[PDB]
Design brief:
Blueprint (H helix, E strand, L loop, with lengths): L16 E5 L7 H9 L4 E8 L5 E9 L2 H11 L13 E4 L12
Antiparallel strand pairs: 1-3, 1-4, 2-3
């Protein structure tokens, strides 16, 4: 059943990345690997490390599709609170075109 949508509007965006922050300088790529994937499959993972060297409490994680992404987000972001931080984990859809834009130039 449920065949035939005949309704295309505000269709979802195009991006398989997720920006995670409010992390602790203890966890490792692995920890975040299993944890995340624990819900929705992951395509790639890359921990962020500022020039200083010590993790900046951030990392880039990708998923197979949107649905899965949201699952991990709600299941993670706003759920627990990384050690040290007072605010629940922060996981949002990572953007690609930040600097660029249709700005009237």
């Amino acid at each position: 059943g449920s065949s035939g949508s005949s309704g295309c509007l505000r269709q979802p965006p195009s991006h398989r990345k997720l920006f995670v922050g409010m992390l602790n300088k203890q966890q490792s790529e692995d920890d975040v690997r299993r944890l995340f994937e624990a819900f929705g499959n992951i395509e790639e993972c890359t921990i962020l490390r500022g020039p200083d060297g010590n993790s900046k409490g951030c990392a880039f994680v990708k998923y197979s599709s949107h649905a899965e992404a949201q699952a991990a987000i709600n299941a993670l972001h706003g759920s627990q609170t990384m050690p040290g931080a007072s605010s629940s984990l922060v996981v949002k859809f990572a953007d690609t075109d930040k600097e660029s834009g249709p700005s009237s130039g």
